[PDB]
Amino acid sequence: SLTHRKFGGSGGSPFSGLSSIAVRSGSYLDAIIIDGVHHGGSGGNLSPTFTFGSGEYISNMTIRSGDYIDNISFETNMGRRFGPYGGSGGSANTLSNVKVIQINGSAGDYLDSLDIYYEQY
Amino acid sequence: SLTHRKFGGSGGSPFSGLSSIAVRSGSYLDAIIIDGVHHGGSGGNLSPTFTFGSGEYISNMTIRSGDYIDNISFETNMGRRFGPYGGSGGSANTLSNVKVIQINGSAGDYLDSLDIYYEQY
Numbered sequence: 096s097l098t099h100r101k102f103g104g105s106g107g108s109p110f111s112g113l114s115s116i117a118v119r120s121g122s123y124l125d126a127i128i129i130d131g132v133h134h135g136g137s138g139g140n141l142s143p144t145f146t147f148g149s150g151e152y153i154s155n156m157t158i159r160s161g162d163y164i165d166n167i168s169f170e171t172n173m174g175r176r177f178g179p180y181g182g183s184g185g186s187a188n189t190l191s192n193v194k195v196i197q198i199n200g201s202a203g204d205y206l207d208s209l210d211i212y213y214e215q216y
Numbered sequence: 217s218l219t220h221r222k223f224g225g226s227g228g229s230p231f232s233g234l235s236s237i238a239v240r241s242g243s244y245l246d247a248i249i250i251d252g253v254h255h256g257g258s259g260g261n262l263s264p265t266f267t268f269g270s271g272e273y274i275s276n277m278t279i280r281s282g283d284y285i286d287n288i289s290f291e292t293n294m295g296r297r298f299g300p301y302g303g304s305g306g307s308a309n310t311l312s313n314v315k316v317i318q319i320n321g322s323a324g325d326y327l328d329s330l331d332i333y334y335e336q337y
């Protein structure tokens with residue numbers, strides 16, 4: 096049962112545990128890199144690193160996928176954009192008016208799957 | 217509305233975007249360091265970094281807090297312990313039988329608050 100709980104007081108600027116995103120891709124996704132940590136294989140080319148600013152988060156995400164992840168692009172609430180990186184294969188699925196909280200998944204030599212935790216607004 | 221969605225197929229080995237945790241602390245938390253990214257002040261003392269192995273996640277977590285996060289400890293599904301690190305004041309709150317998905321918060325010179333995203337079992 097997916098939930099969240101707050102602890103602590105009212106001070107501070109807010110932050111996410113999810114700080115940055117990169118991928119290795121060719122015609123597939125070989126890897127996703129999250130806060131610098133590699134998940135996947137060695138194939139494809141390494142994209143530049145997207146680092147979220149304070150209060151920035153993924154609000155819109157397009158992922159083409161089949162048995163693997165074929166492509167990823169997203170947009171933030173601040174208008175910045177990442178991708179698309181990958182091939183034209185797979186089915187396109189979209190997330191819109193969301194807030195991505197976390198990005199988990201399953202990887203071998205290629206990025207097989209992503210489990211995207213998010214708030215739907 | 218908090219939720220999630222899986223894209224892609226059924227192979228590969230599971231990974232989490234949440235891979236490492238350290239804190240800076242004395243009698244309360246100055247900072248939490250999540251996968252290498254520093255959130256909060258220069259104060260207190262830097263804990264060793266906890267790095268989650270393949271298939272390991274937080275299953276139990278005790279937080280003390282008041283206006284600030286005062287203490288964190290957690291246990292993983294694999295019997296590993298992080299902390300307790302911090303002070304003995306504020307009120308104690310425990311998550312048991314969980315899987316922690318994400319740790320967000322607010323931070324200034326100190327760690328003010330955490331918003332913990334988790335599956336409750």
Ligand SMILES: CC(=O)N[C@@H]1[C@@H](O)[C@H](O)[C@@H](CO)O[C@H]1O
Pocket residue numbers: 160161162163164165182183184185186
């Ligand atoms: C063959 C095709 O048209 N689309 C495939 C899809 O079925 C496959 O599972 C996916 C992920 O590996 O890659 C696409 O290119």
